[PDB]
From Swiss-Prot:
Belongs to the orange carotenoid-binding protein family. It comes from Nostoc sp. (strain PCC 7120 / SAG 25.82 / UTEX 2576). It holds the Pfam family Carot_N. This is Orange carotenoid-binding domain-containing protein. GO terms for cellular component: phycobilisome; plasma membrane-derived thylakoid membrane. The keyword Thylakoid applies.
Length: 150
């Protein structure tokens, strides 16, 4: 608006969601578990069966279903995931990050390096305030998979 007496410049939380969702699947997977490994248990209070199905997949099938979630592909796992309340998506991703971190689950390929563009968003996210990171992470993972109900 021409009302630029020095007023707002945007949402930043919205900007990050946008620049996030403009990323490749692997970048998005990468950025997600960096930002979930670090958030730790602070996203939801300090689902459980979808995790088992993934936890017990061959690492390439885990890749398959992670890419499916980020690409909103209408697979069994995207519908099981999409059917979860958005605050369960929070607890799911937390535990997913712990399985990824402990080595039971493999997001991104075995040769993956975050790109300059991926490292860009990751840094924009990291420097948001605590509550803003929670919003960005809640929203970007709530549009993941597919809602059969919706």
């Amino acid at each position: 608006f021409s009302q630029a007496f020095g007023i707002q410049t945007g949402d930043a939380v919205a900007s990050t969601i946008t620049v996030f969702q403009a990323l490749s699947i692997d970048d998005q997977l990468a950025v997600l578990w960096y930002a979930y490994t670090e958030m730790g248990r602070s996203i939801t209070p300090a689902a459980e069966g979808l995790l088992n199905q993934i936890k017990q997949m061959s690492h390439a099938e885990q890749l398959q279903v992670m890419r499916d979630l980020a690409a909103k592909n209408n697979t069994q796992v995207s519908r099981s995931y999409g059917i979860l309340s958005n605050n369960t998506k929070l607890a799911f991703w937390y535990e997913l990050s712990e399985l990824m971190v402990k080595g039971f689950v493999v997001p991104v390929p075995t040769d993956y390096k975050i790109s300059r563009d991926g490292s860009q968003v990751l840094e924009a996210l990291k420097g948001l305030d605590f509550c803003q990171q929670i919003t960005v992470l809640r929203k970007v993972v709530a549009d993941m998979g597919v809602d059969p109900l919706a």
